[PDB]
Structure 1
């Protein structure tokens, strides 16, 4: 039942469900990141706690509650008068909506702290899943410190307006929820690896960081403006700042946030098309802010330039190789015809993504994976070669390890009559044909998967032109042959002497018949 399942449960961090969970926790973290500072600085997000009072001229001048026509074209800023119950009868629905999302994100934090409690870890290359071990490792580590500091429900008692003690609230007490940044960094690291566009995603995440910095600096600008006093000079938000409040513009919560966000965007991007500071404290703030903005712009530029140089590195390497080849062919005075042939073949290899190397797989993988990949590509082709049909699979594994790719262009000759023959060819991705001594005839056409030269790899010792090629073979279009050298065959064969004698017997048989 529920008790059994929850008493036994332990988590595997490498699942996909755990990744989706880390995304849920990232959503909750981003909720806190934006809205705790927004509710601290922009108090009316939970509903106004006080009444705005404007000095209105009717017969005479008296102090009344501001309308929207009183908050347009102001000659001074309004003054505030607290409600007896700090806006609770008028805005309890707004405040219960905020409380509900607070409890939702805190329940997410509690589920996360439980999954941390029953969290499986790697030990001896395996993930440990014994409830006793995982909880003991949880307590040995000090994850519980960060888990408990991040959930202290201090904002529930002291973060809301309490009218009985005239406590106005302190939403900033929910900033301990921001200690859980490791799960968010983990989610973003995992999202980059699962991404099909890892450079683009990295730039996007930096842009998201910049937008959140601009939001926090918007809240900082407005908090500094309100601490200096709104409308007291031409730099703070207010009626003397004519970019803040132009002619027919109303002073609203939306206007305060919109102007502060625009101000912060222009300052942290070093555009600076905002009013100049007036007081020494504003000069200090703006100087520091513009130096931060210089660094922020250099960071955006560095990330974009890094992405741009990473995504053009292969074309640059190809162009370097092509330039070197052309330089060589100029210095050593090669024909124009062979030069255009070289450039055609190199351009084909580019626009078809071939790379002319198996070192991609060779170097960076472990030999187990290399052997498995090679056996999946070459083994079934190699087992039908008519001299390897009666061998043990170990020999063929060693052989599929030692196969070399050779590429040919249209009309190229693989071999010609009376040539040294010391190889065996397997046709992959092409088509060959055996032409009668002039290039205007055809005997047979070799398709993919066929084999040519398989007796020239044995040594039958008196086999009627054993070493010479005895045929002409040319490529129809671009071909991809795989070659098993004679040296490689005998090197591998010396370890299997029973397969050796049998190969010799089969070769003599095929030769005689």
Structure 2
């Protein structure tokens, strides 16, 4: 049953279902961040627990409950009288909605605590899936302290307005759900690997951080502006501030959050077009908040500057290389036709997205993975060279591991008649031809997969010709040859005696064949 399915369960963290679970815990953490500091500071989000009483002149000035016309053009801020049961007779649907979402995110935290309990730790490469072993790995570690502080249910006791003991409600006691930050950091990292664009996702995560810090500073500004007193200064929120409440503007909860977000956006990006402070504690808060805004603006400028300089590094290294050899050509007074040819060759080098390098796979992959990336490209092409047909595959492994890439220009010759031939040519993505001394084509136009110079690698002393090419091979287009020198085949043939005997036999066969 499902009880023994739970008793014999152990989660390993590398699947995609656990990654979607880390997305769910990231959603619950973002909820806990935003709406716990907003329900602490603003407190009309869970329904107003105090009736707003304005001073209204009709007859005489009486004290009556504020309508939306009494909050426009205020001469003084409305005073509050609490309800008997603190907004519970009329905002219970709001509070049951907030209690339902708090219980949903605490159920998400409970299921993440159980997945921390049956969590497969990686021992020696493989993951442990035995239940007692991951249980003792949990209890031997100190994950249960962070799982226990993040699940104290005391917000359900002392976080809602209780009318019987006249408790005003304290929703800052749900800040202990915010120390599950390792799961959100794991979800952001494992999304940053598999993303389509890592630099743009780093910038989107940085502006999500910026919106969260601006929101927390908005709640901090309205808490300080409520603790000092609303409408007592020209800096705090209220009627005496003419930016927060202008002429025909109602004072509502949306106006409070909208002006506090505008204040923290103008302070933390160092624009500062808000009213200047009046008292001393407002000067201390605005000075500390503007120094933090200078550091936040420098963080934004540094992250966007590193995002720009990371994605335009290959282009400026290309410009460094292009300017270096253009400086080398204009220092040495070369003809201009070669300069047209090399700049059109760099245009081909950009429009193929290549860099004349094998060095990235020569460096950063281990030699087994280098062997697999060698075999899944050139092995099926290098089985069809008609001398490597009946041979051992290990020699082919050492040969495909030692292939070299050369790119040619259109109209440019590879090797002329009467040249010291010591290389074998394997054509990839090109078209070669043999030409009868810049006249017509002789016999064949070598397409992709074909081979030229397989006779001048086996080193037969004087059968028909030793090592001369006896061909004028021309590239009609941009051709990407794959060349294998005589030294590499004779090293890999020095490691194989019987294959040396067999390749000498097949070479004498194909050389006495013509």
1:483 Cα shift? 1.1
Please say if residues 464 and 511 of structure 2, whose CA atoms lie closer than 8 Å, have aligned partners that are also in contact: no
SS at structure 2 position matched to 1:127: coil
SS at structure 1 position matched to 2:55: strand
1:439 Cα shift? 3.2
Superposed CA deviations along residues 9-29 of structure 1, whole A, max 9, x for unmatched, are: 000101111110000000000
Give the stretch that moved more between structures: 214-223 or 435-444.
435-444
SS at structure 2 position matched to 1:417: coil
Mapped to 2, the partners of 1:413 and 1:4 lie a distance apart of 74
SS at structure 2 position matched to 1:371: helix
Please say if residues 436 and 443 of structure 1, whose CA atoms lie closer than 8 Å, have aligned partners that are also in contact: no
**TM value normalised by structure 2:** 0.99
1:110 Cα shift? 0.1
1:409 Cα shift? 0.7
Pick closer, same or farther for the CA change 1:438–1:265 going to 2, 3 Å: closer
Please say if residues 460 and 466 of structure 1, whose CA atoms lie closer than 8 Å, have aligned partners that are also in contact: yes
Mapped to 2, the partners of 1:254 and 1:197 lie a distance apart of 36
1:440 Cα shift? 3.2
Mapped to 2, the partners of 1:352 and 1:100 lie a distance apart of 57
Please say if residues 455 and 507 of structure 2, whose CA atoms lie closer than 8 Å, have aligned partners that are also in contact: yes
1:466 Cα shift? 1.7
Mapped to 1, the partners of 2:97 and 2:439 lie a distance apart of 85
Mapped to 1, the partners of 2:380 and 2:32 lie a distance apart of 59
Superposed CA deviations along residues 63-106 of structure 1, whole A, max 9, x for unmatched, are: 11111111110110111111111110111110000000000000
Superposed CA deviations along residues 193-248 of structure 1, whole A, max 9, x for unmatched, are: 11121011111111111111111111111111111111111111011001111001
Q: Residue 282 of structure 1 corresponds to which residue in structure 2?
A: 282
Structure 2 residue runs without a partner (length 5+): none
Mapped to 2, the partners of 1:16 and 1:22 lie a distance apart of 10
1:383 Cα shift? 1.2
SS at structure 1 position matched to 2:442: coil
Superposed CA deviations along residues 82-141 of structure 1, whole A, max 9, x for unmatched, are: 111111011111000000000000000000000000000111111111000001000000
Please say if residues 77 and 230 of structure 1, whose CA atoms lie closer than 8 Å, have aligned partners that are also in contact: yes
Mapped to 2, the partners of 1:483 and 1:109 lie a distance apart of 60
Please say if residues 49 and 82 of structure 2, whose CA atoms lie closer than 8 Å, have aligned partners that are also in contact: yes
Q: Residue 420 of structure 1 corresponds to which residue in structure 2?
A: 420
Q: Residue 261 of structure 1 corresponds to which residue in structure 2?
A: 261
* 1:34 counterpart = 2:70: no
Mapped to 2, the partners of 1:91 and 1:479 lie a distance apart of 76
1:46 Cα shift? 0.4
Superposed CA deviations along residues 21-63 of structure 1, whole A, max 9, x for unmatched, are: 0000000000010011101111110001111111111111111
Superposed CA deviations along residues 326-355 of structure 1, whole A, max 9, x for unmatched, are: 111111111111111111112211222121
Give the stretch that moved more between structures: 371-380 or 106-115.
371-380
Q: Residue 87 of structure 1 corresponds to which residue in structure 2?
A: 87
Superposed CA deviations along residues 176-195 of structure 1, whole A, max 9, x for unmatched, are: 00011110011101111111
Please say if residues 399 and 489 of structure 1, whose CA atoms lie closer than 8 Å, have aligned partners that are also in contact: yes
Mapped to 2, the partners of 1:379 and 1:264 lie a distance apart of 62
Mapped to 2, the partners of 1:264 and 1:417 lie a distance apart of 78
Mapped to 2, the partners of 1:484 and 1:61 lie a distance apart of 101
1:421 Cα shift? 1.1
1:283 Cα shift? 0.7
Give the stretch that moved more between structures: 292-301 or 351-360.
351-360
Structure 1 residue runs without a partner (length 5+): none
Mapped to 2, the partners of 1:153 and 1:23 lie a distance apart of 23
SS at structure 1 position matched to 2:443: coil
Superposed CA deviations along residues 368-387 of structure 1, whole A, max 9, x for unmatched, are: 01011111111111111111
Mapped to 2, the partners of 1:233 and 1:376 lie a distance apart of 74
Q: Residue 468 of structure 1 corresponds to which residue in structure 2?
A: 468
Q: Residue 357 of structure 1 corresponds to which residue in structure 2?
A: 357
| Runs of 4 or more above 6 Å deviation | none
Q: Residue 60 of structure 2 corresponds to which residue in structure 1?
A: 60
Superposed CA deviations along residues 436-477 of structure 1, whole A, max 9, x for unmatched, are: 123334321111001111111012211222211111111110
**TM value normalised by structure 1:** 0.99
Please say if residues 155 and 174 of structure 1, whose CA atoms lie closer than 8 Å, have aligned partners that are also in contact: yes
Mapped to 2, the partners of 1:442 and 1:454 lie a distance apart of 19
SS at structure 1 position matched to 2:300: helix
Mapped to 2, the partners of 1:267 and 1:375 lie a distance apart of 59
Give the stretch that moved more between structures: 336-345 or 185-194.
336-345
Mapped to 2, the partners of 1:199 and 1:42 lie a distance apart of 36
> Alignment RMSD, CA only?
0.9
Mapped to 2, the partners of 1:11 and 1:362 lie a distance apart of 37
Mapped to 2, the partners of 1:337 and 1:467 lie a distance apart of 32
SS at structure 1 position matched to 2:374: helix
Give the stretch that moved more between structures: 97-106 or 343-352.
343-352
**Count of residues in Structure 1 that have an aligned counterpart in Structure 2:** 513
Q: Residue 97 of structure 2 corresponds to which residue in structure 1?
A: 97
Please say if residues 414 and 475 of structure 2, whose CA atoms lie closer than 8 Å, have aligned partners that are also in contact: yes
Please say if residues 433 and 441 of structure 2, whose CA atoms lie closer than 8 Å, have aligned partners that are also in contact: no
Mapped to 2, the partners of 1:458 and 1:427 lie a distance apart of 19
